[PDB]
Design a protein around this ligand. Structure first.
Ligand SMILES: O=c1[nH]cc(I)c(=O)[nH]1
Ligand SMILES: O=c1[nH]cc(I)c(=O)[nH]1
Ligand SMILES: [Ca+2]
Ligand SMILES: [Ca+2]
Ligand SMILES: [Zn+2]
Ligand SMILES: [Zn+2]
Ligand SMILES: [Zn+2]
Ligand SMILES: [Zn+2]
Lengths: 524, 524
């Protein structure tokens, strides 16, 4: 039997440095986790012990910290080249800076193949990008070869900025003929590596004949066999076994997000490329694994430009930005309005004739707003100022919620009003009126929402059965601040851009801001 | 006696081409007026007949048409140099593109002295601008000399973009020592040429000892002795005689605006520089005066880049811009919101610790909105599209109105609601609620306004005795669409930027717009 060791990452999201246990800023270094210097140590150790190793990334290196803001993907090519990745699939966030922001910094600089079989280009872009990403690559491993076939979320146009000159095809439709072609080329060991989420990964494993292993991402899925080593709760066993339509057992793997774990799957193959066995588990990259000193020293050199950038003027405010708890946990605050307006601006995507924009609505818990910004420093706003407002290292995510769920969220917002608690909601594209004289659970007396399926945006009453797209913090999508109804009732969730980055981009674009308190939230 | 002919313009405001009788676009060429080619003809004729002639401009050549938008003052230097102006005073609109937009195109290119005695600079700007404008110039005229002393509105920081490195001094305080110094230099014939408005011009004539003549501007004042030749109604005789504190008769002149008239004042002086007599009248530049063919051919050559610019993309909309009368004469319309938001953005000026911005409020009659803009031309917006929305060649002006006046304006807005009439108001920084079941004059049931004297902008009830700054069309400041209360009751009026230009600048800055209907105007 021929044994392959698959090492894999996904949704690293700009965690070049070690992090806290929750993937935010490292404060207590003796208990920090992840980062590329520690990954380097572990990969190097495994490559010293195992003959046949592939190191794969399932996409979404782009977006997540000030690293991406400043280096715009150059850090991804540099550090992925230093760890000698064997292949990467394109994720949705690889399109955040458009096609141009993918071609240059990443496709032209990577020393490893970058894969997606379900993205096509037309017009002059097709010539410009031809061969810079591939449907698949056949890689030599010891005396054998392994085919790696890529895929990227069909939903990327709604979740990033790929532009109007790329088409994202159905993953299974695109994959099958490529896997069929590899079999004609005498390649009998096939890995599907891609970025569509665990549910699609299971469909690919079931339906794409000839796929031996699926290595996925996007959904930040944690799989584990046994007692988990940290706080993440497994969604299933590692690997997750799918019974294929042709009667084979096909392992499906993912490795959470943020570089906290290295996925590790051992596969035994027979002479004909059938999987005989698969076993493994993600490895927690905790402080017991030393950071490689060389990579750490390069990280520290690259940090200098981040420190410099952190104190530069992004733009100006002519108004006090009221992020005080005394305001934002009690009533509409202009900091809340600013952040929600930034959130909606970040989620402007290509719009057909059926909507002005696919999403119009935002909620933001007041507990997530942690500082004001004074306008009397010549109006300057810096990244450091925004990091005091938004200190948790979160994202502003896209969800789909029934109107009944959103009404329950607004009732929760004021259920125990008057105690300075974090659940009070700041809003965009929503007008709410509360009557605090009513019983908890029955305090929302008006709730109007901005249309999407309209040429002129205007407000209509919320409909209990309609499904709304809403931008909100990952903290709320995960049921933080008692929003268990959002976690339990949402119909779709996709992780978005870094919180600070969303607001910094908006401020830079606007140049001078003056957010008002304008009646989005009233009391009767 | 030594006789001087003073020819003078003021507030030409980018009317390089001949205009209609109302100073808008020329449609019926056989009845058009003004423009620099016709001015050239008349000036040349007078200089052939009169030995001692000065041609003076009292400021505000900048701002008013697409000429200024595209050529940014290069057209002003070029055509003022071609007509051989003898001197110009700085107007408020000469600062619309900042100090940098005055130094280059105008101060470095003019072949005539540019004057203001009451503007000082500090820091590095003082070195950069030293001598590029002067307090005064002594000009030879025949065998004599004439001193010309300039001044510029002390209110310029509120009415343009001069920046924080210029100080505008009290005009009379600054002028007196300069006029005193000219007398020590044996200059006994002194013209005060400046840009503060007719009321200040009369104060200068009264109080600045040694001023023989005041040639003013800013207030677009029309003076005439006799039956007027066109539609403008005189504010007084030409010249307007002020009795000075030292007992002299001091003539004060102005010549309306828009290049429609050439001011013409004949002064007789004695040997000691005392005015013996003054008489004259502005000359209507109507179609009986031919356009100079050479200047007209140069105007037509410069027009090519304007035509090209007119069809260029300024920015994008992802929403239908509803400028239909069926919307904007009946309810809040998103075109109205866009234009008022552009108006407030245009009037962001330097703000001390006492206000976030000096003005927060906007009204716009629906009758002034003359077209929608469709978003389905790939979202493109062009100048030509904006000219269909705003076709009248107006300005967005700054006024001061008591709250009682503004309440009367909102009652007028709906006094005869339901007939598709032009007075229905679109708004910014104002939230109004109407009850149409009430008697005309008593339909406004809520009227809240955005604060200025606040660090966080928020809405408060309108106060009847408080004076508000409001941005509104010149058409309304002049009592158009039945707003006689605005004309009759306003406390201050200053003309603003060209309507199209205000909206085009905002669209270019924003890049992608998506104005909503959001509840600024409600019905109960
Ligand atoms: O909004 C929040 N995000 C994360 C934490 I931890 C919290 O208290 N609040
Ligand atoms: O708003 C307007 N400006 C100018 C005219 I003439 C008119 O009808 N309406
Ligand atoms: Ca196989
Ligand atoms: Ca004199
Ligand atoms: Zn991701
Ligand atoms: Zn993803
Ligand atoms: Zn003017
Ligand atoms: Zn002026």
């Amino acid at each position: 039997p021929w044994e392959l060791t698959i090492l894999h990452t996904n949704d690293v999201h700009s965690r070049l440095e070690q992090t806290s246990e929750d993937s935010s800023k490292c404060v207590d270094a003796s208990r920090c986790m992840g980062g590329v210097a520690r990954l380097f140590t572990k990969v190097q150790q495994i490559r010293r012990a195992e003959p046949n190793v592939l190191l794969l990334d399932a996409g979404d290196q782009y977006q997540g910290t000030i690293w991406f803001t400043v280096y715009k993907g150059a850090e991804v090519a540099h550090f992925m080249n230093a760890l000698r990745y064997d292949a990467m699939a394109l994720g949705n966030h690889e399109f955040d800076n458009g096609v141009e922001g993918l071609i240059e910094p990443l496709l032209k600089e990577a020393k490893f193949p970058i894969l997606s079989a379900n993205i096509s280009a037309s017009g002059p872009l097709a010539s410009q990008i031809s061969g810079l990403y591939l449907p698949y690559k056949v890689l030599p491993v010891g005396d054998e070869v392994v085919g790696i076939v890529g895929y990227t979320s069909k939903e990327t146009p709604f979740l990033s900025n790929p532009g109007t000159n790329l088409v994202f095809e159905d993953e299974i439709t695109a994959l099958q003929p490529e896997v069929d072609k590899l079999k004609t080329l005498n390649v009998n060991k096939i890995i599907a590596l891609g970025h569509s989420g665990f549910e699609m990964d299971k469909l690919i494993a079931q339906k794409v004949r000839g796929v031996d292993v699926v290595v996925g991402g996007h959904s930040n899925t944690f799989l584990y066999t046994g007692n988990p080593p940290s706080k993440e709760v497994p969604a299933g066993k590692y690997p997750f076994i799918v019974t294929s339509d042709d009667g084979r057992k096909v392992p499906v793997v993912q490795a959470y997000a943020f570089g906290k774990y290295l996925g590790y799957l051992k596969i035994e193959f027979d002479e004909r490329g059938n999987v005989i066995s698969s076993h493994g588990n993600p490895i927690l990259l905790d402080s017991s694994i030393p950071e490689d000193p060389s990579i750490k020293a390069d990280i520290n050199k690259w940090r200098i430009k981040l420190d410099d950038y952190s104190t530069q003027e992004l733009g100006k405010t002519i108004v006090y930005l009221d992020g005080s708890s005394q305001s934002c946990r009690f009533r509409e605050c202009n900091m809340g309005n600013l952040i929600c307006d930034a959130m909606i601006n970040n989620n402007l995507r290509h719009a057909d004739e059926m909507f002005w924009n696919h999403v119009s609505m935002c909620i933001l818990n007041g507990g997530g707003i942690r500082s004001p910004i004074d306008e009397r420093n010549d109006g300057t706003i810096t990244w450091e100022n925004l990091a005091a407002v938004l200190p948790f290292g979160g994202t502003f995510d896209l969800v789909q919620l029934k109107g009944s769920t959103l009404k329950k969220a607004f009732e929760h917002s004021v259920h125990r009003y008057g105690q300075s608690t974090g659940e009070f909601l700041q809003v965009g594209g929503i007008h709410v009126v509360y009557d605090l004289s009513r019983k908890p659970g029955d305090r929302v007396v008006k709730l109007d929402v901005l249309c999407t399926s309209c040429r002129v945006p205007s407000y209509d009453p919320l409909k209990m059965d309609e499904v709304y797209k809403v931008i909100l913090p990952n903290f709320l999508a995960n049921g933080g601040d008692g929003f268990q109804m959002i976690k339990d009732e949402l119909l779709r969730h996709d992780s978005g851009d870094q919180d600070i980055n969303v607001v910094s981009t908006y401020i830079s674009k606007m140049k001078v801001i003056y957010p008002a308190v304008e009646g989005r939230i009233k009391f009767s």
